[PDB]
Design a protein around this ligand. Structure first.
Ligand SMILES: Nc1ncnc2c1ncn2[C@@H]1O[C@H](COP(=O)(O)OP(=O)(O)NP(=O)(O)O)[C@@H](O)[C@H]1O
Ligand SMILES: [Mg+2]
Length: 337
């Protein structure tokens, strides 16, 4: 493999209550010390990391995420995005529903952990001054909604890419007020019950931290980068969700967006001169243009259920996760002068 691929961590959660009630057996097995998973006891996939159901939040973060976050201090953009079927563990893994109740709980996921690490590293970079800002949006039924509110349009600037016109941002100072923004946005994120997840995310959420870094003795030059922390909505099937009405139309919109994402992953996984990548098909894929194929170090956390009743869905995630690893990104150092 040449260049800088998208990196992929496969995270299998434990069986959940619904699966135990339905009498499901585990259909995934793991090869200890190797980043491989075997599915339907027949097909094997390899990723950059494989985390079995016993893997704690802290291990997922320290092994797969932390090294990436430390790269922002070199001036890189970075993205972590969670991808998989409804109920698979995206929100859990990302801390997409974190509230202050979870502070100091070992169950906290990626976004609160990132915030802790950023301020730990800032504290050790005494020679530098930092400015952090955050925005937090959801894509809900084809609309971009600002989660830091108690219309927004994409414009593509001809130089330097996508601009989300109307989206607000908060400048943050310390860890506490940074994580408060997560909490604030999570109180607004559209969540509702289906049979597959009592706390299903009905939107794709993107928490973005903008970081500017300047050396104190050389203050004309800085680095300016962005960290995108993405808790996608997940594929769902009406026969399993039992959704009707507004809930069903949410699932339709979600599924349609995730098809557009699959199209982008598939085009990029087989990229070459003159190829076309259909970023423009959805608002989601427009916002992920640098994250997938562009100026970003990117990790996908592909989330799966171990239950045999979800074999088809799990196979789909594994296949797209395998394609994602063939995506080549081009992260540069984001100098500003
Ligand atoms: N690794 C894990 N260990 C223990 N419980 C988990 C794990 N992952 C997920 N769960 C639980 O499984 C349920 C579904 O997880 P959640 O993260 O909400 O799924 P999701 O992938 O975000 N689904 P959706 O938003 O509907 O597309 C929640 O009650 C979680 O607390
Ligand atoms: Mg969710």
């Amino acid at each position: 493999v040449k260049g800088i691929p998208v990196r992929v961590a496969l995270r299998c959660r434990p069986l959940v209550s619904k699966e135990i009630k339905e009498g499901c057996q585990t259909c995934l097995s793991f090869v200890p010390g190797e980043p491989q998973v075997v599915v339907g006891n027949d097909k094997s996939f390899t990723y950059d990391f494989v985390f079995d159901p016993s893997t704690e939040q802290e291990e997922v973060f320290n092994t797969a995420v932390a090294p990436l976050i430390k790269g922002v201090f070199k001036g890189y953009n970075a993205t972590v995005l969670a991808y998989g079927q409804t109920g698979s563990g995206k929100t859990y893994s990302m801390g997409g529903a974190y509230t202050a109740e979870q502070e100091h709980d070992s169950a906290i996921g990626v976004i609160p952990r990132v915030i802790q690490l950023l301020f730990k590293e800032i504290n050790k970079k005494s020679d530098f001054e930092f400015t952090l800002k955050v925005s937090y949006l959801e894509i809900y039924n084809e609309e971009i909604l600002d989660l830091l509110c108690s219309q927004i349009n994409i414009r593509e600037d001809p130089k330097e890419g996508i601009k989300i016109v109307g989206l607000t941002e908060k400048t943050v100072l310390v860890a506490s007020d940074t994580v408060s923004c997560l909490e604030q946005g999570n109180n607004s994120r559209t969540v509702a019950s289906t049979a597959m997840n009592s706390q299903s995310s009905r939107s794709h959420a993107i928490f973005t931290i903008s970081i500017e870094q300047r050396k104190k003795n050389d203050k004309n030059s800085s680095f300016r980068s962005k960290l995108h922390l993405v808790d996608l909505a997940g594929s769902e099937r009406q026969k399993k969700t039992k959704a009707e009405g507004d809930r069903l139309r949410e699932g339709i919109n979600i599924n349609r967006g995730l098809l557009c994402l699959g199209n982008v992953i598939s085009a990029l996984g087989d990229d070459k001169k003159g190829n076309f990548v259909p970023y423009r098909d959805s608002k989601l894929t427009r916002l992920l243009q640098d994250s997938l194929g562009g100026n970003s170090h990117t990790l996908m956390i592909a989330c799966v259920s171990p239950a045999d009743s979800n074999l088809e869905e799990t196979l789909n995630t594994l296949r797209y996760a395998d394609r994602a690893r063939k995506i080549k990104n081009k992260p540069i150092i984001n100098h500003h002068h």
